[PDB]
Design a binder for this molecule. Structure first.
Ligand SMILES: N#CCc1cc(O)cc2cc(-c3ccc(O)cc3)oc12
Ligand SMILES: N#CCc1cc(O)cc2cc(-c3ccc(O)cc3)oc12
Lengths: 238, 11, 238, 11
């Protein structure tokens, strides 16, 4: 295995094949979404998605070489970030809409249904448009997500940090590779590589805000108790 | 914190 | 003016010459420090530093090219992030210590003096070590900071976004240039370029946390009435 | 919010 011996193409394939499935929301809401109504939906979705992420994480080259304690940590910091990059990637072709699920496409206005939720919707949408504006390829999308998983909790945890960095380097050669084959010039490659990474900065920022927002919804018991999703949220107070 | 732990260990 | 016209070396020089000074903490309160005591210090420092940052921001190529409303926004989102990258950069050659001011070098333990403060300290320190671990050259340091100023508030604000991106591209060619001249290979350059940007992700994360922490200190009344610094903090609730 | 505004204009 060792994520340091697979050619770029083996890396991209490994990441594509590891891709989780896309899930559906509850097929029975639709009704003038109330704040409770809509929150139970997104959390129920997030809860079932977490299970697929946990099993996705293992399929990411080298993640396993890690100690359990370190796999636990990494997913506790990036769980929302990763959920968000997916949503953003799925919303790509629905300008003005956020495709939370194939049966739950929301536009900015519905974000107003939950106190403080619209702000984050705007950020998510801006990034969606940013990806489309950049015509982000799926091949790149899987890299970016794998990077987030490894680079978010690495500095909060030395041989463990070392591995994460050796790997993150392979994901960067592989990312550059994807750009080279698309005919870009060197300047356009490192130029694009910088553009994509700079977005991971807003994805962090949006996650921090959402994390704080989710926590605010819990203090209003407006959010159900999906244990897995609760633990994840709790990892951000510890 | 066990839920996340358990799931990371399964087959 | 246009920054997209000046050459790489002109860019680095422009950024070095624009650099702000390393201010001093208030002399006398030497040590130790009460939670109040230490907070009055860091905020008084941050408050006087803001004035220098505002004037630094104008000296950054292409910034004064933005409209006022946009310069105001950009600085409202990155002010703490920028303060932090500076501290981290100044702490570089002070393993285990955070050089807030020459006359105010703090080690992890003193972070325990202010509630919830220590946690941030560990993050700052981990980044300091990360920079030293990477031998960050000042030339790179000035680029990274300029990037933060432009890339933090750009998706929270279309010709305005366009400029910010055209510029951010110049700062990336210029950043690549700095690595090329250091003898690094192409692979090592885009590899290093990715490493540096991925750190801007933790700098965002640490800022979010500090921002939330500062706000928590205001609700306790340990934070002096530093108007400029208050407005900045307020831009993150409004 | 004026402090930040004023300072950005001193030109
Ligand atoms: N929007 C926004 C911020 C946001 C706030 C909140 O209190 C809960 C959730 C859940 C999800 C969510 C669930 C499933 C996904 O695939 C993506 C996001 O996003 C959320
Ligand atoms: N550490 C930490 C987080 C942190 C928390 C807080 O409540 C106030 C401040 C002020 C500064 C500060 C001041 C001047 C600098 O140059 C850099 C950081 O950092 C802070």
């Amino acid at each position: 295995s060792l994520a340091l011996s697979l050619t770029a193409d083996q890396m991209v394939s490994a990441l594509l094949d590891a891709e989780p499935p896309i899930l559906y929301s509850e097929y029975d809401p639709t009704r003038p979404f109330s704040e409770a109504s809509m929150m139970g939906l997104l959390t129920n979705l997030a809860d079932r998605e977490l299970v697929h992420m946990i099993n996705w994480a293992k399929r990411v080259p080298g993640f396993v070489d890690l100690t359990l304690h370190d796999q636990v940590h990494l997913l506790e910091c990036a769980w929302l970030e990763i959920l968000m990059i997916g949503l953003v990637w799925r919303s790509m072709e629905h300008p003005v809409k956020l495709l939370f699920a194939p049966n739950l496409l929301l536009d900015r206005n519905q974000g107003k249904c939950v106190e403080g939720m619209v702000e984050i919707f705007d950020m998510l949408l801006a990034t969606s448009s940013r990806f489309r504006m950049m015509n982000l390829q799926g091949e790149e999308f899987v890299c970016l997500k794998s990077i987030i998983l490894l680079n978010s909790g690495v500095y909060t945890f030395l041989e463990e940090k070392d591995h994460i960095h050796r790997v993150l380097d392979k994901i960067t050669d592989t990312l550059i590779h994807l750009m080279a084959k698309a005919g870009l010039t060197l300047q356009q490659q490192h130029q694009r590589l910088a553009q994509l990474l700079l977005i991971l900065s807003h994805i962090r920022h949006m996650s921090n805000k959402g994390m704080e927002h989710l926590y605010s919804m819990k203090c209003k018991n407006v959010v159900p108790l999906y244990d897995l999703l609760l633990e994840m949220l709790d990892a951000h107070r510890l | 914190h066990k839920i996340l732990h358990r799931l990371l260990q399964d087959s």
